[PDB]
Amino acid sequence: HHVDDDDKMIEMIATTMSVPRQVEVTEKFKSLVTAHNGKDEEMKDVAQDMKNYMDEKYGRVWQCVILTGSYWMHFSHEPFLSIQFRYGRHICLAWRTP
Amino acid sequence: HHVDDDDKMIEMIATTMSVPRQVEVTEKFKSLVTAHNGKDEEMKDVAQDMKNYMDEKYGRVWQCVILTGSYWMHFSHEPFLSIQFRYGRHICLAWRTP
């Protein structure tokens, strides 16, 4: 019912990934953001480590965008692996391109 | 000095594109957003037409993200064509991947 910035939850927005990958990707984001104390000038580094973790673990090439606010996007009409989720104030968009 | 939502200006954030392409890409964004009256539920379509215009005019594959708010991103340490700019409340991120 009621959290704060310590025990806040991951909220899925949209994904085409398998359940087990959704869990890995979101737990990784959780630990990366927490390590850096959630600082905003640290988010470029979080975006970088997300992209590297996923390149290594699911093959290349991933894009990662972190934001606060609203967004509208387009990459492909084709199927591709993507995930969009919220962790507190940050929204992570990650997806893979051929 | 002073504008409104009709004669608002394009504000460059970051780019690796040539001057003449910056001009083409930003004028295109201007006309696409203006046609759709700047509506927010229209922005997915604007993101789509941006991506298609650039695929056709500069070769594939482009990604386009439109947002309001703050953002931190990562695709590559390598050189790639990208552009980030603001038009009023909307921020356009567009870049090309091999």
Q: In order across it, which strands form the biggest sheet of chain A? A: 1-3-4-2
Helix content of chain A: 25-40%
**Oligomeric composition of the shown chains:** homodimer
H-E order of chain A: EHHEEE
- Overall body shape of chain A: globular
Specify which chain pair forms the largest interface: A-B, 26 and 26 residues
Number of domains of chain A: 1
Biggest sheet overview of chain A: 4 strands, antiparallel
Helix/strand/pairing class of chain A, anyone?
Answer: alpha+beta
Strand composition percent of chain A:
25-35%
End-to-end Cα distance of chain A, whole Å, is 41 Å
Specify Rg of chain A, calculated over alpha carbons. 13 Å
Number of helices of chain A: 2
User: What's the count of strands of chain A?
Assistant: 4
PDB class: cell adhesion
Keywords: cell adhesion
Assembly: dimeric
Entry title: Fasciola hepatica calcium binding protein FhCaBP2: Structure of the dynein light chain-like domain. P6422 native.
In summary, what is this structure?
The structure is a homodimer of 98-residue chains. The first copy, chain A, is of the alpha+beta class and 98 residues long.
Describe this structure in words.
Chains A, B: One of its GO terms (molecular function) is calcium ion binding. Chains A, B: This is Calcium binding protein. Chains A, B: Keywords: Calcium. Two copies of one chain form a homodimer. Chain A has 98 residues and is an alpha+beta fold. Chain A has one domain. Helices cover 34% and strands 33% of the residues of chain A. Chain A has helices at residues 19-35, 43-58, and strands at 10-15, 62-74, 82-87, 90-96. In chain A, strands 1-3-4-2 form a four-stranded antiparallel sheet. In chain A, strand 3 (82-87) and strand 4 (90-96) form a beta hairpin. In chain A, helix 1 (19-35) runs antiparallel to helix 2. The radius of gyration of chain A is 13 Å and the shape is globular. The N and C termini of chain A lie far apart (41 Å). The A-B interface holds A 40, 43-44, 46-48, 50-51, 61, 63-76, 93, 97-98 and B 40, 43-44, 46-48, 50-51, 61, 63-76, 93, 97-98.
